Design a protein around this ligand. Structure first.
Ligand code: SPH
Ligand code: SPH
Lengths: 178, 276, 251, 57, 251, 251, 276, 57
């Protein structure tokens, strides 16, 4: 899916039972494969330390007649991954009601014991997990396609800072370009 | 609060309002300015962090090797000749090229530093006694008379800027002002060189910076010696405009932006996480 | 307006078609006053680790659904540190922010009454017989009404038109309520204060209020629309405080 | 012609002196201590102002 | 609000579901200042015969559409007196009002990114080979991306997830952009200023910016809805001025 | 004087032969300041349900006893709501009131050093081998030293004269300490502040300090006196606060 | 009296008092503040001694060798390769390690100085003539691209800090600020890296300072030359907290505090003294 | 921006000058002349004050 536009398209559909998971990834904005080639992720790979809160914006790209609720949760890294929507309702979360405003922002707060986390990941400065769950369902009228699309956007907040310049582990060369 | 210092977060309590800071519209082109104080209860934190390392002068102001020039005290062929040259460019190395190509137009002064090192060529004998080698790095502006050989008259450098350096001392260094005939250095040029939309496509037509000629000013050695001169560019007094997307694909050539098609990121096996 | 954002602790509720907020009997929840207390020891007040949103399991709404009920604070007996503070304390006291949410479409139709009934003491299905407590309410399970009468030998009378209390179900609109009409309404939020005849109470031997969700106009739609609509209940405690620290209960 | 400026120090004898030696301004050192910024050219470049609390549409 | 009216010259655009206007890098287009000019001769400024709206041909949006690009000012080379002034002058300078418009229904779904990329210098499909200029952009034709890679011996690399520039297509949101989400958005208007490293330039040997229109969420609908949705691009020059009058070009 | 009364929460300690109170490094425990915090979310502070006295199991003091150690906050992992708040939170921060108590007689003799060592990182008994965490400290069990060296393949080096840290045991009197000399002293109370290089920390992967109790002069008495003397440790958290609420840990 | 100057003793005469400065209680945790003036008759002495040498800046502010890095101009194996590296740590040498481990948390700026020396490898012949050798010491921050070989692209050092030094001159020296992500450098960490109390026990999980890569930037020599680079750390602007007991036992490893059990001091034959 | 300070001399032409050359405070020399101290965190860290002449218990 990485060799097409299918990589950006988070699929949702009407469900048979509620509380299933939509997606999930570790909050490693310079090391995780989901976030390290984004525009925020590429700047952080020039640096060794990062600090601050982040903004995950979501965008429902389905039909205007389709409704839905979602729970997007952030978990601090102590207990492990949340295993259900009951496990995810205990951390920092937001319930998003899909309506006339197509977008919602989950603000990931800086909950750390150090003032800086590392860009290349380690176990001392682990930042936690981001998961999304069906709060209710997708309910549509007839004559509408089943699968819809959600787009996820990342950006930094106004308390974000980076530190300790380095070379990025993304560009390589074996000889001089002639 | 000082310039360059990040913002504090304010103490926020519970809400039940008709205000909706979490709900927005990406379709407007607008990035939402949501603070953690808007969507959850926070405490008052006095943040003392600074954006020092992230400035354009601090991100760019480190010297990076841009060319490795090779020349000898005895000619093998015209690649290992007595002298060599280099058309001045920033696109042959990949580390500095990716940093400059994050912007469309830049405007900076330069510091050029040379790390020249010699080595004795492989021979059947090495036992000699030679005086210390001295090198010349002459800059030729675009359109000047270039050295066509060793022992040339063009190395008289009466109006071209030259530098001389004996091995053993500190590395040579000079400063270069902003040299473009426009108002900024163009990292990208979406166009052609001829008015009929033909010729050369790309940024190559906007790069006329001249050549840099290297030699040994010593006449001879007892046994041949190969030299290598590394060229280090550090940009200072940097302005930059129109920030570009970072490059995904590695480079193939120095005069093109040509690439091989690659995926947008590295993969994983499924879209969820599955533990407790 | 139809938009509303409720933030409690590290949790946020957003709604784009909100009717309004019903606030109790006109009273906002608060902590107990000094001229009304009885216990003398210092209370504990975990302000954000307990007064946050806790969501329950969804229930499938069908055409033949009679309704569901939840009894509180026993519905949140295992929900984080709200459940850990109930076990270690003799007394407790809290108000709630109940948020029931159900979206369908502009091509569905139905209406749900969402009442909060204080002291909804239920009768027995088989009379001259006392019933079990796990039939009244499990720990977070939605106990559900029936369309006809119940002949359970140890359960409540779950006929929905009598509402389990021997009253008319149409007269429940004196208790704090909203409606979820699918034509216009997406969710329904009720803020309940602390209602009791004592200032604090034990949170295990007493169900302080019961949340009922009852379809008055039943769910019907075309067969080619989405046949599954869930009803999720998200409840936040408010100004919860505790007294009487001892070992973990609850016998 | 000495410019005494403030050194980069942390937060909870802090000054340096600079003399310019050359007659060209391109010969000068780097401007390390300039941390000015305004990100509204990129993050919020819309014509009508968009308040956070109000609905965007 | 969602309504907006843009009037330039003898032409008007009306929109009933407008998101907003994105204005460039926060800069409105204007004429060149006296302290920034280089050429000494008096410029010509046809204010209403050139700074009017010029609409291009529609493109059919399908489910398997990868995207389209237009390169400017070469996209308007024959559009009225804007095209006649390019031929007779050596230098030119202008900002634009790009207006992309696509309506479907409340029963369709899709999303289009509409970016304006300054100096969108494209690589070659077959490398070690220079490409033709008519494969980069014809005079008003929409040059279109592909879902997979291109093996054209004299064309650009039209794989859409690399955007022709060797970058990630997801990172194009630093360039001035909007989105057309069919759920909520009808059109998308971008006002671009003049972006160049020189104050004026030749309008034939240089593509100043490239307008890309890329489906991020693809178009899908029921088969019994309208299977044809077009995407029309209407572009107005703004504060266009010219210098260096000679014979008609452009070689 | 020799009398002292310490009241924290719903618990009181009385002592009739008190030496003094040693307060840390001259610092009383307090809550984190706004100019020193890193996390942005609101902390929870259960003031009396957590900052109360929790007593551990007694250890039998013999003539051949080498000593015991407890590692904190892992020694109170299951002690009421102090243990329930560790499981639900990523970060925590607290100071302590350690109270060690041992009475014998006017006919017994002995002396115990009671040190609080911050970051008492212990070496391995069998070297070139990493040890298990349950040999360093169980949940409330007193891990005990030995008179001679340890040859445990997965345990710490419990020889008491090296104190497990490779140092001389006589030099532990720079850490905050008291002595229980049975001739004159009944108990020993140490108030520790929060000592760490970070303002908050995780309370599972890090032992912040270790309480050691070491007989310097061994217990000896007549055989016709009481042959059993216990040593009880009562620890109260102080100004405990928490951050990072998520599901119950602790992996 | 100046700061750092010791106290004078006052003249004291005979006493017969109910005051008892000699009698105290060690059980209180209190160190008695007894002066010689309290227990005997003294004279007035004006003490001019100062505690200058005992300050934390003076006790720590001397440069100590922390690593000996070896690399050659011709590879024998990957231990005598063309290049070498070192994970930055203070625990491989014992003199500086015992001085730092007298405190639990420290916070200092650094001075790194290199004493690089070369020597001609043992051969059947040595009679050659080589130009002066130039070395590169590139610092790689934690998570950057490391040199996988000689002739690597990662030695282009466009954003990593590098230094270049020709043999014969003064030793190279740069200054390093305080680099921890916490508020102090932890000399000790009583804990684990994973939340399940497993993985790595000790201070190793709190030491992510990066690597330091060494090479010869000269391409070749006539006969192979072995180099040795000594790394010298001098801490300056030092703060320190929570003073530790000094270590009795010698060290065994660099990543542990593991020891062999030893007696508390050296012995003697009896507890008394027996002469006149 | 010259800081003239007192040199380390004995007890029974005594000044030095310092110019800071670099823009970072970590580039500065050592703080050799700071002899402040307070040993009551370690030697007498008890809650109630203990006068020498009075009995400790
Ligand atoms: C022997 C003395 C040598 C003196 C060296 C003088 C050479 C420098 C003169 C030209 C400087 C060109 C600077 C290059 C800038 C880049 O090409 C722009 N980023 C791209 O346009
Ligand atoms: C070629 C240029 C070389 C530049 C050298 C930069 C290397 C220094 C950066 C890291 C400094 C780490 C300082 C180490 C402190 C100790 O580990 C602490 N006492 C223990 O945590």
């Amino acid at each position: 899916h990485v060799n097409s536009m299918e990589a950006y398209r988070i699929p949702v559909r009407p469900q048979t039972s509620s509380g299933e998971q939509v997606f999930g990834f570790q909050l490693q904005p310079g090391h995780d494969s989901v976030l390290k080639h984004t525009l925020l992720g590429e700047i952080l790979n020039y640096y060794a330390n990062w600090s601050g809160s982040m903004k995950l914006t979501f965008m429902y790209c389905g039909a205007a007649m389709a409704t839905g609720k979602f729970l997007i949760a952030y978990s601090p890294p102590g207990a492990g991954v949340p295993g259900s929507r009951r496990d995810a309702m205990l951390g920092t979360h937001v319930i998003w009601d899909v309506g006339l405003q197509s977008s919602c922002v989950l603000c990931v707060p800086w909950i750390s014991q150090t003032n800086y986390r590392y860009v290349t990941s380690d176990a001392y400065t682990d930042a936690g997990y981001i998961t999304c769950w069906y709060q209710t369902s997708i309910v549509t009228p007839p004559d509408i396609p089943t699968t819809s699309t959600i787009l996820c956007f990342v950006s930094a907040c106004n308390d974000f800072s980076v530190r300790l310049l380095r070379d990025t582990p993304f560009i390589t060369q074996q000889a001089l370009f002639q | 609060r000082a310039v360059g210092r990040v913002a504090d977060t304010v103490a926020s309590g519970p809400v039940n309002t008709e205000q909706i800071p979490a709900l927005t519209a990406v379709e407007t082109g607008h990035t939402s300015q949501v603070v953690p104080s808007d969507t959850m209860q926070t405490r008052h934190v006095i943040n003392y962090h600074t954006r020092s390392e992230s400035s354009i002068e601090n991100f760019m102001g480190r010297a990076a090797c841009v060319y490795i020039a090779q020349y000898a005290t005895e000619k093998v062929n015209d690649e290992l000749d007595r002298y060599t040259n280099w058309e001045i460019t920033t696109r042959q190395v990949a580390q500095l090229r990716r940093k400059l190509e994050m912007f469309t137009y830049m405007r900076f002064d330069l510091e050029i530093t040379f790390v020249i090192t010699s080595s004795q060529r492989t021979s059947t004998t090495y036992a000699s006694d030679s005086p210390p080698l001295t090198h010349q790095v002459m800059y030729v502006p675009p359109g000047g008379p270039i050295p066509k050989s060793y022992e040339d008259f063009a190395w008289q450098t009466s109006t071209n800027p030259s530098v001389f350096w004996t091995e053993g001392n500190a590395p040579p260094r000079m400063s270069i002002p902003f040299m473009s005939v426009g108002n900024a250095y163009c990292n990208f040029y979406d166009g052609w060189s001829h008015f009929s939309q033909s010729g050369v496509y790309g940024y190559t037509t906007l790069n006329n910076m001249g050549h840099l000629y290297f030699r040994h000013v010593n006449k001879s050695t007892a046994y041949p010696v190969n030299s290598v001169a590394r060229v280090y560019f550090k940009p200072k007094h940097v302005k930059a405009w129109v920030p570009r997307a970072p490059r995904l694909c590695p480079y193939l050539k120095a005069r093109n932006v040509n690439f091989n098609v690659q995926g947008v990121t590295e993969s994983r096996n499924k879209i969820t996480l599955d533990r407790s | 307006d139809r938009v509303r954002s409720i933030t409690l602790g590290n949790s946020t509720i957003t709604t784009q078609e909100c009717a309004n907020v019903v606030v109790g009997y006109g009273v906002w929840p608060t902590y107990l006053s000094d001229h009304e207390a009885t216990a003398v020891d210092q209370p504990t007040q975990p302000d954000v680790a307990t007064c946050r949103f806790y969501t329950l399991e969804s229930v499938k709404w069908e055409s033949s659904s009679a309704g569901w009920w939840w009894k509180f604070p026993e519905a949140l007996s295992d929900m984080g540190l709200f459940g850990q503070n109930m076990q270690y304390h003799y007394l407790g006291r809290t108000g709630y922010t109940i948020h029931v949410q159900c979206n369908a479409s502009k091509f569905h139709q139905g209406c749900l009454l969402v009442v909060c009934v204080p002291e909804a003491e239920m009768g027995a299905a088989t009379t001259d017989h006392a019933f079990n407590h796990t039939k009244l309410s499990n720990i977070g399970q939605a106990m559900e009404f029936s369309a006809k009468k119940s002949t359970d030998q140890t359960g409540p009378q779950t006929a929905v038109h009598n509402a389990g209390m021997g009253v008319a179900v149409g007269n429940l609109t004196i208790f704090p309520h909203q409606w979820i009409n699918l034509r216009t309404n997406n969710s329904a939020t009720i803020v309940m204060p602390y209602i009791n005849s004592v200032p604090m109470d034990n949170m295990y031997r007493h169900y302080n209020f019961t949340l009922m969700v009852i379809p008055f106009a039943k769910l019907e739609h075309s067969p080619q629309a989405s046949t599954y609509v869930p009803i999720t209940v998200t409840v936040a405690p408010m100004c919860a405080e505790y007294n009487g620290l001892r070992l973990a209960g609850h016998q | 012609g000495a410019q005494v400026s403030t050194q980069k120090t942390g937060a909870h004898i802090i000054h340096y002196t600079n003399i310019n030696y050359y007659k060209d301004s391109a010969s000068n050192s780097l401007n390390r201590q300039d941390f000015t910024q305004d990100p509204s050219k990129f993050t919020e470049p819309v014509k009508d102002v968009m308040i956070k609390t109000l609905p965007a549409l």
